[PDB]
């Protein structure tokens, strides 16, 4: 195995959210598996980090003498973190494994408690910088939930447990490393949630189905409101504990209100229906704003009024239950569940919604303009030795038309400016006339020009002049003579700039000069013999950069200090043609990189680059007209005006189904998708399967949806039989038959299945062409050399399709526990078992039977399988690991991925081969192959990167990537994510890794192009 794995889409499902004071600031922290996102509540993003672990626990807490952050991963890495140029420093770390997960922190910060295993409670006393823990044995072996109580002299836990449900308390003594007698209580049969109520109340609230109880050493309520659905999350609104939000498995939002000598006791409890949200994994009141963190659908900000109003939606692709690639190249996912169910159509790059196109060749520059003293109404265009003005063709008074314009626009004191190769022209507004004209003393040609609203700097060979724009006056402030010819200039004020950026011929430097002086603050030799073509100073977020494009397509960029002029730190290649850089706004600042590979540059806290979906753009400008409210773009022959999609790497389109999609397959001849779905009927709401144009027949109700490939309209829905679950889908032709079918495999499911069907359909409507009753669940189906291969419990069967439109068994394979997965290549079949890993079959065409070629004898609970090639078989299993196999299958590659894979398919949104995969967390990845020689180089690089990069938990990358079920170093796999991070680290760290730095940049740049 020489395989390489990389993230195409980071995980999007929310697994945890908390509020606190981590960075006076109110923070939202969010866990998305391997990512921790940190926001300031205004949500202003501040920092995202990747951990080398799956986040299991995430708790903020303030010891005596800002909140610190405790994290635990699913591999039991424990750390205490501090936010401190942003750093997350590790205050304490250690591994707390013993030879789901619940983590809780005492309110007086005396200790951390962990429920990792039945029958043990692990305590980390809070200086143990190594986070040494001890175990206490708990006699109650099945703990449902546990919390630390608030009003207590000794640290006291309160928990629900199940035995042949009860609430008990214990004191946790650090002297005795043991429990003490804590009040106790039998409680509701489905009590599943403990809430420690703060002072003045103290005590605990217990959430069941149908029941809510408070205890402090009766009181209970049983509101009919809450029995219809299970409450899955709760959140404290007031510090008092007087109000709590609660969320259900249907997205209903409740408030729970506590009615309050000289103490305060609980008088009563009330529950009130607030409204509907996405199905919440977590809830955090911000301030009446609530963050709804979702696993099964999109997350949200909602407003609570004096009842719920959604402010913002955040894309969650998870769970990705199935997907396919269709043309080019686009990914269509079965996404989410229940009322959140959807299709997502995922495409690389940024699109342009073109609103006007004009036949105009030779455009050599482009400027927007306001002729009326707030919207642009004019577009000025440049040509070789010429200028033309467009109204939104016209003529502007004051402007020349028989010289080339180098810059023009709106300037200080209600004026316009035009700079040409001959002079700088200042033009009044009311009316329009030449009010000032600057020329070089000997009337030599202006060669390069830059301009803001107040300042002008122009070059004349090696000479620079700094002008200021005054009421009816171009005032020459200063000048100088550069050492080489000036190549490019910028004076973007980061509205008066104390700085000039320049690029020179001959020495190929980028310089930062002071204004008015022209003192050098910084020189950078850029290397080579190609000149800088564009140069630009820019603010992204609240950070300042120099950007500098060469004539060959290379782009250098640097952090920049306004006060110092210092350039620090990176190269990237964007096209082969010279890049022209232009700023535009879309909310935020962005730079358009005009070339044969057009590109937006944006900001992470790190410059990102995303392909614009045009063939070529030579020049562009932003355009806020009344008619085109936008961008203007110019190639060799057209002037385009349009809108641009959101600035982001993946464009995602959502088709809501309002029920659960399960399988998808494309049918090219029909120009449609077939999609299996199920809805819960009690029908709860309208959903895709109840809203089709046509429908046919013949708790969970399953359907086959026919969905238009262009509009994504539900054209037809076929309902299955009562108690019939649809499990497998194929679109194919069979035998000599020229027709293309949707074929479905089912299971009749009664309170494993012993009955099922295979149904052949043809698509305005869906006719049933053939059925075949079978003696089990039809878990998997795949077309196989014009025959139908099917898995039915522990049987793998091959059917032929006869002249009389029936399926007829040809052969069977029996040596499985449960054949869940099937992939095919040529005459070879890859079988994934429920518990016995992977099996390689061969159809023997001359004998009409199967032959087992090889088997992997390691038990593996499979989630998905793929054939990488004739001799290499990929597996994903239930403990988040990938493996590759080659009469024994040898396990030659092993990798801890950290995600649960539901689907693999061959394809690309743009090494040998390309398999994308979809995940429970909505992460999308890619697996590809390498030569021994690329592997060896990149393994070595991985090892060097690991020695140089600081990991946030102080977790070892080798540990994190170790194959682990109920452990072994990763082998034959490159962590592509680690590799790509080489482009983000500092210049000296890059040099530290390298013992050229720029030669590895070219290697990693090539690797980023595969997705």
Residues 6+ apart with CB under 8 A from 202: 149, 150, 151, 152, 216
Torsion angle, CA of 966/971/975/978, rounded to 10 degrees? 100
Task: Please list, residue by residue across 714-733, b when 16 or more beta carbons sit within 10 angstroms of its beta carbon and e when fewer do.
Answer: bbbbbbbeebbbbbbbbbbe
Query: Do the beta carbons of residue 360 and residue 637 sit within 8 Å?
Result: yes
Query: Do the beta carbons of residue 895 and residue 915 sit within 8 Å?
Result: no
Number of H helices, E strands in the chain: 5, 86
The candidate with the shortest Cα–Cα distance to 203, out of 260, 150, 264, is 150
Residues 6+ apart with CB under 8 A from 258: 197, 201, 214, 241, 242, 243, 244, 266, 268, 269
- Distance, CA of 475 to chain centre: 51
Task: Please list, residue by residue across 584-598, b when 16 or more beta carbons sit within 10 angstroms of its beta carbon and e when fewer do.
Answer: bebeeebbbbbbbbb
Domain 1-13+317-348+650-929 fold is Methylamine Dehydrogenase; Chain H (2.130.10)
**Whole-angstrom distance, CA of residue 931 vs CA of residue 915:** 17
H or E element: which one contains 388? strand 386-391
Could you count the other beta carbons within 10 Å of the beta carbon of residue 491? 23
The candidate with the shortest Cα–Cα distance to 408, out of 459, 364, 449, 460, is 449
Q: Which DSSP letter does residue 394 get?
A: B
Joined tokens for residue 168: 């008990």
Pinpoint the residues of the chain covered by CATH 2.130.10.10. 1-13+317-348+650-929, 14-316, 349-649
- Distance, CA of 198 to chain centre: 36
Q: How far is CA 173 from CA 109, 116, 155, 732, 789, in A?
A: 14, 19, 7, 67, 62
SS (H, E, C) 175-204: CCCEEEECCCCCCCCCCCEEEECCCCCCCE
Query: Do the beta carbons of residue 457 and residue 468 sit within 8 Å?
Result: no
**Angle, vertex CA 418, rays to CA 414 and CA 423, nearest 5:** 125
Strands (E), 785-890: 787-792, 795-801, 807-813, 819-825, 828-833, 838-844, 849-855, 862-869, 872-877, 881-885
Q: How do strand 714-719 and strand 694-697 relate by DSSP bridges?
A: parallel
**Whole-angstrom distance, CA of residue 159 vs CA of residue 138:** 11
Q: Which DSSP letter does residue 968 get?
A: B
Query: Do the beta carbons of residue 902 and residue 920 sit within 8 Å?
Result: yes
Query: Do the beta carbons of residue 256 and residue 246 sit within 8 Å?
Result: yes
Residues 6+ apart with CB under 8 A from 149: 107, 156, 157, 158, 169, 196, 202, 203, 204
SS3 assignment, position 984: coil
H or E element: which one contains 1005? helix 997-1008
Q: How far is CA 275 from CA 19, 77, 817, in A?
A: 23, 39, 46
H or E element: which one contains 583? strand 580-585
Query: Do the beta carbons of residue 635 and residue 625 sit within 8 Å?
Result: no
**Spatial strand order in the sheet of 660-667:** 660-667, 672-680, 700-708, 714-719, 694-697
Joined tokens for residue 890: 């040898």
**Whole-angstrom distance, CA of residue 9 vs CA of residue 1009:** 14
**Whole-angstrom distance, CA of residue 687 vs CA of residue 661:** 11
Joined tokens for residue 278: 């996405």
* 528 φψ region: left (φ > 0), alpha (ψ -120 to 50), beta (else): left
SS (H, E, C) 876-913: EECCCEEEEECCECCEEEEEECCCCEEEEEECCCCCEE
* 508 φψ region: left (φ > 0), alpha (ψ -120 to 50), beta (else): left
Residues 6+ apart with CB under 8 A from 586: 644, 646, 647
Using the structure block, give the residue that is written with the tokens 């020349």: 400
The candidate with the shortest Cα–Cα distance to 544, out of 603, 489, 593, 610, is 603
Joined tokens for residue 448: 């390069």
**Whole-angstrom distance, CA of residue 582 vs CA of residue 620:** 7
**Whole-angstrom distance, CA of residue 317 vs CA of residue 312:** 16
**Whole-angstrom distance, CA of residue 746 vs CA of residue 749:** 9
Q: Which DSSP letter does residue 957 get?
A: H
SS3 assignment, position 711: coil
**Whole-angstrom distance, CA of residue 853 vs CA of residue 889:** 9
Task: With both helix axes pointing from N to C terminus, report the angle between 997-1008 and 987-994 in degrees, rounded to the nearest 10.
Answer: 100
SS3 assignment, position 847: coil
H or E element: which one contains 1007? helix 997-1008
Enumerate long-range contacts of 379-387, CB under 8 Å, 24 or more apart: 379/621, 379/623, 379/632, 380/405, 380/408, 380/418, 381/634, 381/639, 382/406, 387/418, 387/420
Q: Please classify residue 947 by burial: count the beta carbons closer than 10 Å to its beta carbon, then call 0-12 exposed, 13-18 middle and 19+ buried.
A: exposed
Q: Please classify residue 858 by burial: count the beta carbons closer than 10 Å to its beta carbon, then call 0-12 exposed, 13-18 middle and 19+ buried.
A: middle
| Domain 14-316 part of CATH 1.10.1040.10 | no
Task: With both helix axes pointing from N to C terminus, report the angle between 932-948 and 987-994 in degrees, rounded to the nearest 10.
Answer: 130
Query: Do the beta carbons of residue 916 and residue 961 sit within 8 Å?
Result: no
Residues 6+ apart with CB under 8 A from 619: 363, 364, 365, 366, 580, 582, 594, 633, 634
**Whole-angstrom distance, CA of residue 996 vs CA of residue 985:** 15
Radius of gyration of the chain measured on its C-alpha atoms: 33
Joined tokens for residue 165: 């449900």
Pinpoint the residues of the chain covered by CATH 1.10.150.910. 930-1011
Strands (E), 187-329: 193-196, 204-207, 212-215, 220-221, 231-236, 243-248, 252-259, 268-276, 280-285, 289-294, 299-304, 308-314, 320-326
Residues 6+ apart with CB under 8 A from 396: 369, 371, 378, 380, 389, 416, 427, 432
Q: How far is CA 290 from CA 16, 108, 241, 253, 297, in A?
A: 14, 27, 16, 11, 16
Signed CA dihedral, 455, 460, 462, 463: sign only: negative
SS3 assignment, position 157: strand
Q: Please classify residue 67 by burial: count the beta carbons closer than 10 Å to its beta carbon, then call 0-12 exposed, 13-18 middle and 19+ buried.
A: buried
H or E element: which one contains 410? strand 405-411
Q: Which DSSP letter does residue 991 get?
A: H
Query: Do the beta carbons of residue 318 and residue 919 sit within 8 Å?
Result: yes
H or E element: which one contains 387? strand 386-391
Q: Name the experimental technique.
A: X-ray
Joined tokens for residue 882: 């990938």
Q: How do strand 134-137 and strand 120-125 relate by DSSP bridges?
A: antiparallel
Q: How far is CA 335 from CA 192, 315, 708, 728, in A?
A: 28, 11, 17, 17
Q: Which DSSP letter does residue 224 get?
A: G
**Angle, vertex CA 368, rays to CA 496 and CA 356, nearest 5:** 150
Phi–psi pair at 167, nearest 5 degrees = -120, 130
Joined tokens for residue 555: 């782009």
Residues 6+ apart with CB under 8 A from 170: 156, 157, 179, 180, 181, 182
Question: What end-to-end distance do the CA atoms of the chain give, in Å?
Answer: 21
Domain 930-1011 fold is DNA polymerase; domain 1 (1.10.150)
Joined tokens for residue 291: 């963050």
Residues 6+ apart with CB under 8 A from 952: 36, 49, 50, 51, 52, 79, 81, 88, 90
H or E element: which one contains 425? strand 424-428
Q: How far is CA 31 from CA 459, 487, 550, in A?
A: 52, 48, 41
The candidate with the shortest Cα–Cα distance to 3, out of 948, 821, 877, 869, is 869
Q: Which DSSP letter does residue 574 get?
A: -
Domain 349-649 fold is Methylamine Dehydrogenase; Chain H (2.130.10)
Query: Do the beta carbons of residue 169 and residue 152 sit within 8 Å?
Result: no
Joined tokens for residue 781: 């189906």
**Whole-angstrom distance, CA of residue 107 vs CA of residue 172:** 13
Joined tokens for residue 196: 């420690």
Q: Where are the alpha helices (DSSP H) in 891-996?
A: 932-948, 957-960, 976-980, 987-994
Q: How many CA within 13 A on the CB side of residue 742? A: 33
Q: How far is CA 313 from CA 36, 147, 407, 648, 666, in A?
A: 19, 31, 41, 16, 29
**Whole-angstrom distance, CA of residue 850 vs CA of residue 282:** 50
SS3 assignment, position 1000: helix
The candidate with the shortest Cα–Cα distance to 818, out of 794, 789, 838, 797, is 794
**Whole-angstrom distance, CA of residue 1011 vs CA of residue 1008:** 6
**Angle, vertex CA 320, rays to CA 316 and CA 324, nearest 5:** 120
Query: Do the beta carbons of residue 219 and residue 268 sit within 8 Å?
Result: yes
Using the structure block, give the residue that is written with the tokens 């913002």: 312
Query: Do the beta carbons of residue 73 and residue 953 sit within 8 Å?
Result: yes
Joined tokens for residue 333: 């996912």
Task: Please list, residue by residue across 171-182, b when 16 or more beta carbons sit within 10 angstroms of its beta carbon and e when fewer do.
Answer: bbeeeeeebeeb
Could you count the other beta carbons within 10 Å of the beta carbon of residue 884? 25
Signed CA dihedral, 726, 731, 737, 738: sign only: positive
Enumerate long-range contacts of 795-803, CB under 8 Å, 24 or more apart: 795/819, 796/822, 796/829, 796/831, 796/841, 796/850, 798/843, 798/850, 799/758, 799/772, 800/735, 801/734, 801/735, 801/737, 802/735, 803/735, 803/736
- Resolution of the structure, angstroms: 2.4
Q: How many CA within 13 A on the CB side of residue 597? A: 16
Joined tokens for residue 222: 């049983």
**Whole-angstrom distance, CA of residue 224 vs CA of residue 845:** 64
**Whole-angstrom distance, CA of residue 936 vs CA of residue 879:** 27
**Whole-angstrom distance, CA of residue 459 vs CA of residue 480:** 10
Phi–psi pair at 272, nearest 5 degrees = -130, 125
Query: Do the beta carbons of residue 30 and residue 51 sit within 8 Å?
Result: no
SS (H, E, C) 721-768: CCCEEEEEEEEECCCCCCCCEEEEEEEECCCCCCCEEEEEEECCCCEE
**Whole-angstrom distance, CA of residue 500 vs CA of residue 478:** 12
């Amino acid at each position: 195995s020489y395989n390489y794995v990389v993230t195409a889409q980071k995980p999007t499902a929310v697994n945890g959210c908390v509020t606190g004071h981590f960075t006076e600031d109110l923070n939202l922290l969010i866990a998305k598996n391997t990512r921790l996102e940190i926001y300031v509540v205004t949500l202003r993003p501040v920092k995202e980090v990747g951990m080398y672990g799956k986040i299991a626990v995430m708790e903020l807490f303030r010891p005596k003498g800002k909140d610190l952050l405790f994290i635990l991963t699913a591999k039991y890495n424990a750390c205490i973190l501090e936010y401190k140029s942003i750093d997350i420093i590790t205050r304490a770390h250690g591994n707390v494994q013993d030879r789901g997960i619940i983590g809780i922190i005492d309110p007086e910060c005396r200790m951390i408690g962990l429920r990792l295993y039945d029958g043990l409670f692990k305590v980390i006393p809070l200086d143990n910088k190594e986070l040494k823990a001890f175990n206490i044995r708990l006699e109650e072996l099945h703990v449902i939930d546990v919390k630390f109580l608030y009003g207590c002299q000794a640290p006291t836990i309160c928990f629900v447990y199940q035995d042949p449900r009860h609430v008990k308390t214990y004191e946790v003594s650090l002297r005795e490393k043991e429990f003490n007698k804590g009040w106790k209580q039998n409680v509701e049969a489905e009590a599943s949630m403990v809430i420690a109520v703060p002072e003045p109340f103290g005590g605990a609230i217990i959430i069941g189905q149908e029941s809510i109880t408070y205890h402090n050493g009766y009181l209970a309520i049983a509101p009919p409101i809450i029995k219809q659905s299970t409450i899955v999350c709760h959140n404290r609104v007031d510090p008092n504990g007087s109000r709590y939000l609660l969320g259900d498995m249907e997205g209903r939002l409740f408030m729970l209100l506590l009615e309050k000598d000289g103490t305060v006791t609980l008088k009563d409890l009330r529950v009130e229906l607030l409204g509907e949200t996405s199905i919440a994994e977590c809830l955090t009141y911000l301030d009446g704003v609530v963050f709804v963190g979702s696993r099964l659908g999109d997350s949200q900000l909602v407003k609570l009024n004096v009842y719920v109003v959604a402010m913002e939606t955040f894309t969650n692709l998870g769970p990705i239950v199935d997907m396919c690639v269709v043309d080019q190249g686009q990914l269509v996912t079965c996404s989410g569940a229940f009322k959140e169910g959807s299709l997502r159509i995922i495409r690389n790059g940024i699109g342009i919604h073109e609103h006007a196109s004009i036949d105009l060749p030779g455009i050599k520059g482009l400027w927007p303009l306001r002729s009326d003293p707030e919207t642009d109404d004019t577009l000025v265009l440049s040509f070789v030795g010429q200028t033309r003005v467009l109204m939104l063709e016209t003529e502007l008074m004051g402007f020349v038309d028989d010289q080339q314009t180098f810059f023009c626009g709106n300037v200080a004191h209600q004026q316009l400016i035009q700079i040409t190769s001959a002079s700088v022209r200042l033009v009044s507004q009311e009316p329009k006339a030449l009010v000032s004209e600057w020329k070089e003393p000997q009337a030599k040609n202006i060669s390069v020009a830059s301009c803001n609203s107040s300042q002008v700097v122009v070059a004349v060979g090696r000479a620079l002049y700094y002008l200021q724009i005054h009421p009816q006056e171009l005032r020459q402030i200063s000048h100088t003579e550069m050492e080489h010819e000036v190549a490019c200039l910028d004076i973007t004020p980061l509205g008066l700039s104390p700085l000039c950026a320049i690029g020179l011929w001959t020495d190929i430097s980028a310089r930062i000069l002071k204004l008015p002086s022209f003192e050098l603050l910084h020189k950078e030799m850029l290397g080579g013999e190609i000149i800088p073509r564009s140069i630009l100073m820019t603010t992204f977020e609240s950070s300042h950069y120099l950007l500098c494009a060469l004539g060959d397509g290379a782009l250098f960029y640097f952090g920049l200090n306004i006060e110092t002029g210092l350039l620090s730190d990176k190269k990237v290649t964007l096209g082969t043609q010279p890049t022209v850089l232009r700023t535009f706004r879309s909310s935020t600042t962005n730079v358009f990189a005009c070339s044969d590979r057009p590109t937006v540059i944006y900001s992470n806290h790190k410059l990102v680059f995303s392909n614009v979906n045009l063939k070529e753009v030579n020049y562009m400008c932003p355009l806020n007209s009344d008619g085109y409210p936008s961008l203007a773009l110019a190639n060799n022959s057209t002037l385009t005006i349009g809108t641009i999609d959101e600035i982001q790497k993946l464009h995602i389109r959502t088709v809501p189904l309002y029920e659960s999609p399960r399988k998808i397959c494309y049918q090219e001849v029909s120009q449609c998708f077939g999609v299996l779905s199920s809805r819960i009927e009690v029908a709860l709401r309208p959903s895709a399967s109840t809203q089709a144009l046509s429908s046919s027949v013949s708790v969970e109700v399953h359907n086959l949806l026919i969905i238009d490939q262009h509009t994504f309209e539900v054209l037809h829905a076929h309902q299955f039989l009562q108690n019939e679950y649809a499990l497998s889908l194929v679109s194919c032709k069979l035998g000599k038959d020229p027709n293309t079918y949707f074929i479905v495999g089912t299971a009749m499911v009664y309170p494993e299945p012993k009955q099922g069907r295979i149904v052949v359909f043809q698509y305005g409507k869906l006719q049933t062409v053939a059925e075949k009753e079978v003696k089990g669940a039809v878990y998997s189906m795949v077309e196989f050399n014009g025959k139908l291969l099917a898995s039915i419990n522990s049987t793998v069967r091959l059917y032929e399709w006869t002249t009389e439109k029936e399926l007829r068994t040809e052969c069977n394979h029996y040596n499985n526990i449960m054949a869940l997965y099937l992939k095919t290549k040529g005459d070879f079949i890859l079988v994934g078992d429920l518990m016995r890993s992977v099996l390689l079959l061969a159809y023997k065409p001359m004998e009409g039977n199967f032959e087992e070629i090889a088997r992997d004898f390691n038990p593996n609970w499979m989630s998905a399988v793929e054939i990488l090639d004739d001799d290499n078989f990929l597996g994903a299993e239930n403990a988040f690991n990938l493996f590759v196999c080659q009469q024994h299958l040898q396990e030659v590659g092993l990798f801890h991925l950290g995600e649960f894979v539901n689907v693999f398919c061959h394809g690309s949104l743009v090494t040998q081969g390309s398999v994308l995969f979809g995940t429970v967390n909505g992460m999308i990845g890619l697996v590809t192959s390498l030569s021994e020689s690329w592997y060896n180089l990149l393994l070595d690089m991985q090892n060097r990167l690991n020695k140089v990069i600081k990991s946030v938990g102080k977790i070892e990358h080798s540990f994190w990537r170790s194959f682990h079920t109920e452990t072994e170093p990763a082998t034959g796999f490159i962590d592509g994510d680690l590799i790509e991070s080489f482009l983000d680290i500092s210049r000296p760290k890059m040099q530290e890794v390298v013992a050229t730095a720029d030669d590895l940049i070219k290697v990693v740049e090539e690797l980023t192009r595969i997705h």
